[PDB]
Amino acid sequence: GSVVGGLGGYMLGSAMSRPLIHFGNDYEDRYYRENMYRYPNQVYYRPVDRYSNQNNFVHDCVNITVKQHTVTTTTKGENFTETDIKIMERVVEQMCITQYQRESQAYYQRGAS
Numbered sequence: 001g002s003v004v005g006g007l008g009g010y011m012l013g014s015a016m017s018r019p020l021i022h023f024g025n026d027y028e029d030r031y032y033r034e035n036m037y038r039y040p041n042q043v044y045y046r047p048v049d050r051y052s053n054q055n056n057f058v059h060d061c062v063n064i065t066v067k068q069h070t071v072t073t074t075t076k077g078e079n080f081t082e083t084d085i086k087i088m089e090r091v092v093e094q095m096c097i098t099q100y101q102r103e104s105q106a107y108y109q110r111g112a113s
Helices: 027-035 055-074 082-100 104-109
Strands: none
Touching: 027 082, 055 082
16 A cells, blocks of 8 residues: 555656666666665656656656655665666656657647647
C-alpha cells in the first residue's frame, strides 16, 4: 500500500527493467550494479495535459521526480553521494524523454504547426 498525499500529484511512467544507460565510464557503470535494487527504475510525469513545453517541461519533470527521492535521502543524511545522484540526474531525464516520445502523437494532433 502507498499513502503519499503529495506524490499522487504525479503518475508512474511506462516502466523499464534495469534502465542502465551507458554513461561511457567503467565506474559510473559498475556503481549502478551495486545499488541497482535501491535506484528508482521509473520516473514521475503527467500525460502532456497540465504540463506542456519541452525544454523547461523536462527540467521540471526531471527536477520534481528526482527531488522526490533526493529530498528523501536528505531525510536521514543521504547515503546517495553526489556521483550516486548524478547517475539518476541523467536517467530521470532520459526516461522522461523516453515517456514523452510516446506522447508525440497527442501533441502532433492537438496543435499542428
